[PDB]
From a paper:
Through biochemical and structural analysis, here we show that anthocyanin-related glutathione transferases, currently implicated only in anthocyanin transport, catalyse an essential dehydration of the leucoanthocyanidin dioxygenase product, flavan-3,3,4-triol, to generate cyanidin. Using PtGSTF8 from poplar as a model enzyme, we use biochemical, structural and computational methods to demonstrate that arGSTs employ a GSH-dependent Brønsted base mechanism for conversion of the LDOX product flavan-3,3,4-triol or flavan-3-on-4-ol into flav-2-en-3,4-diol (8-B4), an equilibrium form of cyanidin. Based on the here-presented biochemical, structural and computational evidence, we propose that arGSTs utilize a GSH-dependent Brønsted base mechanism for conversion of the semi-stable LDOX product flavan-3,3,4-triol or flavan-3-on-4-ol into flav-2-en-3,4-diol (8-B4), the 4-hydration species of cyanidin.
To better understand the catalytic machinery of arGSTs, we determined the crystal structure of PtGSTF8 as a ternary complex with GSH and the substrate analogue (−)-catechin to a resolution of 1.09 Å. The structure comprises the typical GST fold with an N-terminal thioredoxin-like domain (β1α1β2α2β3β4α3) and an all-helical C-terminal domain (α4α5α6α7α8). The active-site cavity, which is located between the two domains, comprises a glutathione binding site (G-site), formed mainly by the N-terminal domain, and a hydrophobic substrate-binding site (H-site), which is formed by the C-terminal domain. However, presumably to accommodate (−)-catechin, the active site is substantially enlarged by a shift of the α4′′ and α4′′′ helices by up to 1.71 Å and an upwards movement of the side chain of phenylalanine F112. Within the H-site, the substrate analogue interacts through hydrogen bonds to N108 and the backbone of V12, a π–π interaction with F112, water bridges to R16 and Y175, and hydrophobic interactions with V12 and V115. Interestingly, the amino acid composition of the substrate-binding H-site and the G-site, which binds to GSH through hydrogen bonds and salt bridges, is strikingly uniform amongst arGSTFs, making the existence of similar substrate–enzyme interactions in other arGSTFs plausible. To shed light on the interactions of the enzyme with the natural substrates, we docked flavan-3,3,4-triol and flavan-3-on-4-ol into the active pocket of the crystal structure of PtGSTF8 obtained with (−)-catechin. The best binding poses for both substrates had a highly similar conformation to (−)-catechin, with an RMSD of matched atoms of 0.51 Å for flavan-3,3,4-triol and 0.54 Å for flavan-3-on-4-ol. The docking analyses revealed that the positioning of the GSH-thiolate in relation to C-2 and O-3 of the docked substrates could enable an acid–base mechanism of dehydration or tautomerization, in which the GSH cofactor acts as a proton-relay system.
Numbering used by the authors:
A (entry chain A), B (entry chain A): 2 to 214
The structure:
């Protein structure tokens, strides 16, 4: 049984768990207490040498980097559950393109925002609201590209749900709830409909029930 | 024949071209003048809607995000030239892990450094040396993990050269030349040997001959 390391509430562990749930892969969650810096101490650095979560252990196989992990499990269990990768090399490439868009254009801004608005106040530090503003204005321009895409295609990589969509679930939820920036999605009709669809999937609802969201 | 858009000198176009050269894929380079902001104007935004390079056009197939592109061509031409992906799903996962390490842990720091040290002075702006210092200190800690890995494995993802190594070529060259931070590699014996190996590959030398490096 796969072991997943990290808090249930954290974005990158959730990305992994969402894929495992979609693919029907049993796992055991091992909390790592990011609040207290457990991920930076020697025991955990033997598992993830950059001191970040998640890592997975699957027998004597060990893997980190959330987007590497979801690609691995989507392939290992391709012929079960939803096709998350695409079939043809061109379909697979479009999944990869929209993962790459998620991982930089989108997530660099969303993380920055959530870190200032949500993470830092929890440890007694004021966020930099002016900086958050700059991220918000960049993110509107990124999401205008999403809206254009979703006007043409039901999901990001084509007409079916894939890893590309899945990878957005955890951070987007924080963006539109805890960070108070739901307008970024609600202002964009196709994006809003996409969000209400993907975030209502049974695997995601199960994970949110576990996490308390 | 594949069309690749972007300057020959730029990092992400070079990442793509390195893969095409390794795989023996013919291409035509279409310069995009980043110096003058061509990538932000309407004509180019029809090709890459985030206003960045590269994009590839391969008949009526269009793809952007450099790491999506190199995965596509490594798969489309798997049975020719070097195996860049790995064979087993676990080998492929380790390639993906080290691509993910390149794409965030490594490249976020190297880009930041090169932007301040190299890009901004070329447009008449002083870089923020204090900020560059902070990046340099983070990057030493990242590269200590690389050194540990390369003590155990010839290349990053295993005993052979893969996409994981390839993806580092363009930015590392800037880091150790134009940015003046060659000590980051030279200080680390296994990393230095890895660098002198991968950057001497014939495909890379050909590309550097084209680019003027
Ligand atoms: O330093 C931290 C500590 C945390 O507990 C978390 C951190 C950073 O980042 C959060 C996070 C928030 C938003 C994102 O887009 C993202 O990639 C990660 C994570 O959920 C939880
Ligand atoms: O705004 C720019 C303009 C550019 O011409 C370049 C930019 C940014 O980034 C450079 C760059 C430099 C270092 C990197 O690690 C990286 O990912 C990209 C690129 O080579 C060339
Ligand atoms: N590129 C990594 C990012 C991992 C990451 O940022 N993890 C966060 C949780 S979402 C973390 O461990 N934060 C605490 C820290 O960085 O100290 C991946 O995708 O796995
Ligand atoms: N995530 C993108 C990054 C592309 C990117 O940053 N491209 C740079 C060149 S290396 C660019 O176009 N810079 C100019 C700009 O951002 O305006 C990819 O990997 O393709
Ligand atoms: Na990780
Ligand atoms: Na990340
Ligand atoms: Na304001
Ligand atoms: Na698009
Ligand atoms: Na919890
Ligand atoms: Na691109
Ligand atoms: Na990038
Ligand atoms: Na100093
Ligand atoms: Na390692
Ligand atoms: Na040139």
């Amino acid at each position: 049984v796969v072991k997943v390391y990290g808090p249930a509430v954290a974005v990158c562990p959730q990305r992994v768990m969402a894929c495992l749930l979609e693919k029907g892969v049993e796992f055991d969650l091992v909390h790592v207490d990011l609040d207290s810096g457990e991920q930076k101490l020697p025991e955990f650095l033997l598992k993830q040498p950059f001191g970040q979560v998640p890592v997975v252990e699957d027998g004597d196989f060990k893997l980190f980097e959330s987007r590497a992990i979801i690609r691995y499990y989507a392939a290992k269990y391709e012929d079960r559950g939803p096709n998350l990768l695409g079939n043809t090399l061109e379909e697979k490439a479009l999944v990869d393109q929209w993962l790459e868009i998620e991982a930089h254009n989108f997530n660099d801004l969303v993380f920055n925002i959530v870190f200032q608005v949500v993470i830092l106040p929890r440890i007694g530090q004021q966020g930099d609201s002016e900086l958050v503003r700059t991220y918000e204005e960049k993110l509107e321009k990124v999401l205008d590209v999403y809206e254009k895409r979703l006007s043409k295609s039901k999901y990001l990589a084509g007409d079916s749900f894939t890893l590309a969509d899945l990878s957005h679930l955890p951070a987007t939820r924080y963006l539109v709830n805890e960070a108070g920036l739901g307008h970024l999605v609600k202002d964009r009709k196709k994006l809003n409909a996409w969000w209400e669809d993907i975030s209502s999937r049974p695997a995601w609802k199960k994970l949110m029930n576990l996490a308390g969201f």
